[PDB]
Amino acid sequence: MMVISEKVRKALNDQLNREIYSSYLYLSMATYFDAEGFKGFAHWMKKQAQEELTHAMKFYEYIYERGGRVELEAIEKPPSNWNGIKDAFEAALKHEEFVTQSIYNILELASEEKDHATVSFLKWFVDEQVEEEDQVREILDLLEKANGQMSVIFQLDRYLGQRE
Amino acid sequence: VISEKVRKALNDQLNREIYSSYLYLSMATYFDAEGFKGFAHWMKKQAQEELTHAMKFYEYIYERGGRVELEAIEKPPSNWNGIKDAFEAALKHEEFVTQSIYNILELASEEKDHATVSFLKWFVDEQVEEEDQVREILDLLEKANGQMSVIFQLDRYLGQRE
Ligand SMILES: [Fe+3]
Ligand SMILES: [Fe+3]
Ligand SMILES: [Fe+3]
Ligand SMILES: [Fe+3]
Numbered sequence: 536m537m538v539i540s541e542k543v544r545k546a547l548n549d550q551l552n553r554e555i556y557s558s559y560l561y562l563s564m565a566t567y568f569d570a571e572g573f574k575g576f577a578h579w580m581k582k583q584a585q586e587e588l589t590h591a592m593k594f595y596e597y598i599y600e601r602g603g604r605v606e607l608e609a610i611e612k613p614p615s616n617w618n619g620i621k622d623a624f625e626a627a628l629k630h631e632e633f634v635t636q637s638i639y640n641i642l643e644l645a646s647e648e649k650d651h652a653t654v655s656f657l658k659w660f661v662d663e664q665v666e667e668e669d670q671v672r673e674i675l676d677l678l679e680k681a682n683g684q685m686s687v688i689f690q691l692d693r694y695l696g697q698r699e
Numbered sequence: 700v701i702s703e704k705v706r707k708a709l710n711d712q713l714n715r716e717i718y719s720s721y722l723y724l725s726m727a728t729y730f731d732a733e734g735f736k737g738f739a740h741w742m743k744k745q746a747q748e749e750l751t752h753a754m755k756f757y758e759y760i761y762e763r764g765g766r767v768e769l770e771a772i773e774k775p776p777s778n779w780n781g782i783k784d785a786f787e788a789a790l791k792h793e794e795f796v797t798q799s800i801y802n803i804l805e806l807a808s809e810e811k812d813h814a815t816v817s818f819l820k821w822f823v824d825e826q827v828e829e830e831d832q833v834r835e836i837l838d839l840l841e842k843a844n845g846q847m848s849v850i851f852q853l854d855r856y857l858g859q860r861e
Contacts, residue, residue, distance in 0.1 A: 559717075566768065569767070570766045581754075595728075605728040607724060607725045608774055610721075611771060612770055
């Protein structure tokens, strides 16, 4: 059997695939940062790529817990270049704002269908998306306040390069 | 340090490693659907290992002065006719990759890029054992006929990979 509906199985599978793209996007942003000598922003993005894969593999395991199957879809080629560190991090946030709506959308579907086990599974991703967004809002506020003082940007590079 | 054409060769390979990760993830989605968690486990560890491969390439390209551009990743197959057919597919994939890496070793050696050929030589060593690992599992699955008792033995054996 499948104790989840197929509209829900598919929204979950759709979201697993979105997390994979998100992982690959941030790896793409790391390539831009690495090319521009910002090895610390690059390490932050690599760490974030790995995080998205953790998100992806939570959806994977939930689908198999509830008797569905996962289908991997093609992954779009992501952007490889941005105009400045700010432009990249703004793209990060717009994407995370998009991931946040995607999750809200799946949670209303689950709620509409009264699949409340999926609602409670998704609550963890709702909370985490607030960190995911504020993470980036914090970096953007610091880049902004940097003016363009390269001493300050490099101070931020090095500290984001300590991400555990 | 490091020419263009070897960069495009090293970049193209980086993308192939990304796809290999994704291929093995899709094999795991098949073993999971069919109820073989041991096999699915092994494929998930393989997929991880494949990302460390792509990032050894990543980080070497930047060590030696080049840029990585990431390309679209093709949809991989989702289903196979039995465990053995899946490992047959994996072996044809690894055989292709190993050859891709030997092919690049001869390009870098042609233009006497000795530090690249030395890096590419660390690796073909580790790849050939990735080939021979997949290769022996297949041989085990061949040996097994389709005796499900033995299929299950390997599923628990392989499910213990770390
Ligand atoms: Fe995520
Ligand atoms: Fe995220
Ligand atoms: Fe590999
Ligand atoms: Fe491989």
